Amino acid sequence: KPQEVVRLGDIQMANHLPFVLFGGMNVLESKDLAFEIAETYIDICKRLDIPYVFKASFDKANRSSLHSFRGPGLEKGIEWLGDIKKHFNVPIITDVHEPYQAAPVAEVADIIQLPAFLSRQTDLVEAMAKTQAIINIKKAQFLAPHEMRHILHKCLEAGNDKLILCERGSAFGYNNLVVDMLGFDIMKEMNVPVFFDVTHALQTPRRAQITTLARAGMATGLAGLFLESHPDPDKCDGPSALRLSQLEPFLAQLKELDTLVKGFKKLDTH
Amino acid sequence: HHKPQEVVRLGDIQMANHLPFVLFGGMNVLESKDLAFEIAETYIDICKRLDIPYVFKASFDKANRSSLHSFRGPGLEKGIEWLGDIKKHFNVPIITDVHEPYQAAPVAEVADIIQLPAFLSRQTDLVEAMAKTQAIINIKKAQFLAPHEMRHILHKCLEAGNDKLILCERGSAFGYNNLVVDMLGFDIMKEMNVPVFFDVTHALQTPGGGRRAQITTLARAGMATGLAGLFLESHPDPDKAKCDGPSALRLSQLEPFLAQLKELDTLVKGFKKLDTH
Amino acid sequence: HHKPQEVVRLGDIQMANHLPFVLFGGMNVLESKDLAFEIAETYIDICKRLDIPYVFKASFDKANRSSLHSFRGPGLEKGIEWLGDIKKHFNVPIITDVHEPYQAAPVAEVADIIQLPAFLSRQTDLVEAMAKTQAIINIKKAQFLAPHEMRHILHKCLEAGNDKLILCERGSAFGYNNLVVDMLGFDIMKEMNVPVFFDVTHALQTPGGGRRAQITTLARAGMATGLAGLFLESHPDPDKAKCDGPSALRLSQLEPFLAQLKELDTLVKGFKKLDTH
Amino acid sequence: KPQEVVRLGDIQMANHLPFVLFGGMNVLESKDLAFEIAETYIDICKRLDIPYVFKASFDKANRSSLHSFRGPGLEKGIEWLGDIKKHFNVPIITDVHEPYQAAPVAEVADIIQLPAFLSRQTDLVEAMAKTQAIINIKKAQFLAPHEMRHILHKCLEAGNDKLILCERGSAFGYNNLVVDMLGFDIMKEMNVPVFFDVTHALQTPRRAQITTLARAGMATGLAGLFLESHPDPDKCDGPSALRLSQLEPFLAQLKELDTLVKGFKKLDTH
């Protein structure tokens, strides 16, 4: 069985508890931008009292072209992640793209993220589970909610019970995602923390719509939110990045909605 | 005669996307005169104590059932009589759906809001005959139409001289025998500057494929986007409802359901709007 | 009165999934009496030389256009006159669509096959009034209905006493503003033991989103599954067709298009059936 | 630019040419079953005059459970593939799951297959392209047809021009695939050989329906077909495996349809 309340030192993540923020940037553009963005997140989450985990990729492994910017790479990113972790004493979450990378990533990262497209790749899942870090499972665009249980079951079989499921939209026809809010209940009924990646659910593979979608998801009662920002969204996924100057009022509303929704008695309408 | 009304008024009631949400609530079909009175009384009392504006909803005819022999309700003449009886006895406004152009004028005598069914929303003669009555028009968004396509149906209503128009979401076809609600679609319909409603009841359907246990989660998600109102069907015993019982809310649970949505709506309508363009 | 006819007969013509394919072909709407005569003559000559059974198709009314002012065609009285004129002059059978229950009986005087529009395929009064006329019924499969759901519409037609029934594929909603044809859906409808047709013209649509250049590939794929017939709209100048011009086949290309499909059909209908269960 | 006609020694693959068969089994169950199945394919394709490439995976890398049968693995499969290749003098096609495997797989395999879920992973694509074998691109369930160009463009940027696109269905709602036959024209208009994997397009993640679907796809005019069989479909993907005793009449019909369709003058209906 998976852990219903996933603990990370001081932080407790669960669908009935105050929501936790996995927040940061899409990719490590530079040391100075990462430090600036982290400082902005930590300060805001401290004043709003939202538990916080810093998020950034060391590699964009699945871009369209071989020449697209991929980031600092494994060696430099893991080194840079430690710099952010040691200076601020903040947890780290990043994604893992090849099985061998799991253990070296686990030294620095408190939560290791399983990318959507790779969530079925057994070698990557087994290697990630072995490190014993928390595992954030990105729900694939092509998988139905009930299919999440097998990814949990494979993780449990591989000896890891610190598991989080993260919604990021479902394929809706061509070049378009929809978020089925009814899917949140199905995943919550698996008794794991459930997160919503609002940033990547806007994609039309809609920055003005991030507020609408985050509210709808968090109104269902979720363990946390996954969010990316940038001071000037115009090096990767800029159309989905939230203008960093808008972070605090955005988080403040979500904090208030969550508080209302988390205090509701669950209602059985069977 | 070009623009629709951003605020739709019905006596004391005001419907708009920035205003407190309004409930179109009742039952799927007029199963009997006595049950309709009981259901209306129950909605009216709950909405008064919770302070939620209310319009009673019930169909007089199920025009699109699976079989020729399926239960259809009282029909036009008797159904209009029951709706008027409810309206006069309770002093409550009425919404019901219209299926043929000739039904439009007699239904509008009793119904303050006349509903355009999803499958029929493009049928020009029905849309025109409905527009002519000058009643409020509730447009059900078809399972197969994208949000931006609602603009043409508004224009057709406006062309026929009616500007009291509401758009009501009820799910989109998602593969076979399944609906999904695209919450991003609400913003597109609101930018048309008409009141936009959410029919949570029919957005649960798995047509030809119930999900009654998920109604609260879905209604919370929709109303958190900030909408003009909610469309809802209930029944004292949904297993025996004469149509769409699998999606009906247990009447005994109406009050705690609405109570949560009332506070959520108040919270959301009170947020400062945020420019993220 | 329980079972539908596996072989649907119309004088000399026989329609069934194991028989040579039949063409329901013509134009989207009766744009004018003269153009309808020209188009009918062109189909009839080509089908005779290629030896393809033929039914002339044209709508007398576009009942579901975007605007109240969009071109709708001649309407009921005049359209029925033009269809009868074509029928008597050319000695050709007629298929046209029916939009309201009262239109069913007068249309059936002239039309040998009456067509049930997709959006209306569940409307009980229309289905019954159509069934009563005892004409052949062409059922358009709605963009939002799964194949197995056609069984209920057949049953409703049978309940109302008509067993001359055809199912016609025309695409399924695939996300927003897009249709896909599920070729596996053809087998499900054929196992209902009725003739199954393919409306390749409307399966190209990108509704609210043309694909005229892909019509041959799509028609070949469908007819390779082994079908009772094809539904097709053409126009001498598709850019100026009064409705659905983006999906119309250029009339000058009708003969090479049909010639390929004729040989493909003959090949496929002559294959030994194979049990892979 | 990619090669419009992809050559493999004696075999020529192109959308206007006689269709080529990539045929075999889902997974290498055992040496005896693989030898028996290959013998049956080679004999039938010889008598029907259909050019043939033998297909089998050495690993099922993306199964639901860690304990599901995965096959002989890399070392044994590459060794076993050589046994099939040397005895019969038949080309080999198999799929590659991790970047390092590309070069060792390329020694034995004439065509290396890019799995659908991984088609966007740059490290795997680059490593596969480097080996200079033919690359069969499985079109992801979540990608639209026009998106195939980037996978070609990345391959060309990586110095490989022997490219094949292979359709295998698109996500249609939950747990269901549909094959959009209009997508074949879009991929053919990219001037590469286009194949149809009918076996995996039946999936409802329908054995009696394989005949219907293969005919519809091949009626559009394709460079080839991808097909899996098993003597008793009841160790992997058995619901989609064709009963081996039915192979020859199935192929005979497709040979006849292809001949008709390939002789049609292309018709411009713009």
From Swiss-Prot, chains A, D:
GO cellular component: cytoplasm
Top EC category: transferase
Catalytic activity: D-arabinose 5-phosphate + phosphoenolpyruvate + H2O = 3-deoxy-alpha-D-manno-2-octulosonate-8-phosphate + phosphate
Pfam family name, one: DAHP_synth_1
Keywords for this protein: Cytoplasm, Lipopolysaccharide biosynthesis, Transferase
Protein's pathway: Carbohydrate biosynthesis; 3-deoxy-D-manno-octulosonate biosynthesis; 3-deoxy-D-manno-octulosonate from D-ribulose 5-phosphate: step 2/3; Bacterial outer membrane biogenesis; lipopolysaccharide biosynthesis
Disulfide bridge map: none
Superkingdom of the source species: Bacteria
GO terms classed as biological process: keto-3-deoxy-D-manno-octulosonic acid biosynthetic process
Entry GO MF terms: 3-deoxy-8-phosphooctulonate synthase activity
Enzyme Commission number(s) from the entry: 2.5.1.55
InterPro entries per record: Aldolase_TIM (IPR013785), DAHP1/KDSA (IPR006218), KDO8P_synthase (IPR006269)
Transmembrane intervals: none
Location in the cell: Cytoplasm
NCBIfam families found in the cross-reference section: KDO8P_synth, PRK05198.1
Similarity remark: Belongs to the KdsA family.
Entry protein name: 2-dehydro-3-deoxyphosphooctonate aldolase
Gene name for this UniProt entry: kdsA
UniProtKB/Swiss-Prot annotation, chains B, C:
Enzyme class: transferase
GO BP field: keto-3-deoxy-D-manno-octulosonic acid biosynthetic process
Compartment(s): Cytoplasm
EC numbers, comma separated: 2.5.1.55
Taxonomic superkingdom: Bacteria
Annotated keywords: Cytoplasm, Lipopolysaccharide biosynthesis, Transferase
Reactions catalysed: D-arabinose 5-phosphate + phosphoenolpyruvate + H2O = 3-deoxy-alpha-D-manno-2-octulosonate-8-phosphate + phosphate
Family: Belongs to the KdsA family.
GO molecular function annotation: 3-deoxy-8-phosphooctulonate synthase activity
Pathway(s) of this molecule: Carbohydrate biosynthesis; 3-deoxy-D-manno-octulosonate biosynthesis; 3-deoxy-D-manno-octulosonate from D-ribulose 5-phosphate: step 2/3; Bacterial outer membrane biogenesis; lipopolysaccharide biosynthesis
Protein known as: 2-dehydro-3-deoxyphosphooctonate aldolase
Alphabetized Gene3D superfamilies for the sequence: Aldolase class I
GO cellular component terms given for this protein: cytoplasm
Pfam families: DAHP_synth_1
Coiled-coil features, chain-numbered ranges: none
Organism of derivation: Acinetobacter baumannii (strain AB307-0294)
Entry-linked HAMAP family: KDO8P_synth
